[PDB]
C-alpha cells in the first residue's frame, strides 16, 4: 500500500545521492494513469530522475533494460507492480541477473523478488511504513538502512 512518492523518498534515504533511476514499467498493468504521472510527481519532489522504460511483452525486457543503462547511466532499477508481464518469472529473472550483473540495486514490488536478489521492498500496515531487506545483497550494494527505520525493518 505503499504510494510511489513515499517509495522514492525511502530510496532516497538508503541510496543518498542517487541521481538517475530506471523504472521498467508493464504497458498494460491497471493505473497507468494512477501511477505514471505520480512517477513525474515523485520525481520533481525528491530530485531523483526517473526515466521509465514501457514494456509490451517479454521481447521488449531486454532491449528497454539495456536502454536505460545505454542512455541513461541509472543507477537503480525500481519496478512498481507485477499484475502482469512483470508477475513472469523469466521477467523478474532477467530483470535482477541484469541488474545485480551491473551493479545496480533493485527496489521491488514484492518478497519474492528479494528471495530472488533484489535488495528492498516495503508494505504498510496501521503503524505506517516497515521496509523488508534482503540483507547479504544490501550489504554488497552499500545500502546502510538508517537507524530509525532499523527497528522497523524486516529483513
Given amino acids: ?12 534515504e538508503l541510496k543518498p545521492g542517487i541521481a538517475r533511476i530506471g523504472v521498467i514499467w508493464d504497458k498494460n498493468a491497471a493505473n497507468r494513469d494512477e501511477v505514471l504521472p505520480q512517477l513525474q510527481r515523485a520525481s520533481a ?5 526517473v526515466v521509465v522504460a514501457e ?3 517479454l521481447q521488449e525486457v531486454a532491449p ?3 536502454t536505460l543503462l ?3 547511466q541509472v543507477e537503480a532499477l525500481w519496478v512498481l507492480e507485477e499484475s502482469g508481464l512483470l508477475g513472469q518469472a523469466a521477467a523478474r529473472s532477467f530483470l535482477i541477473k541484469n541488474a545485480t550483473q ?3 540495486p533493485v527496489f521491488a514490488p514484492s518478497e519474492t ?20 531487506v534482503n540483507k547479504a545483497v544490501a550489504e554488497a550494494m552499500g545500502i546502510t538502512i538508517p537507524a530509525k527505520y532499523q527497528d522497523r525493518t524486516a529483513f
Wanted: glycine fraction near 8%.
Fill in 45 to 49: 519532489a525528491t530530485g531523483i530522475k
Fill in 113 to 132: 523478488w528479494l528471495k530472488e536478489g533484489a535488495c528492498v521492498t516495503w508494505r504498510k500496515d496501521a503503524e505506517g511504513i516497515r521496509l523488508v
Fill in 64 to 66: 528497454q533494460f539495456r
Fill in 55 to 57: 514494456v509490451a511483452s
Fill in 1 to 12: 500500500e505503499v504510494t510511489p512518492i513515499q517509495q522514492l523518498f525511502l530510496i532516497k
Fill in 102 to 104: 551491473a551493479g545496480m
Fill in 70 to 72: 545505454r542512455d541513461h
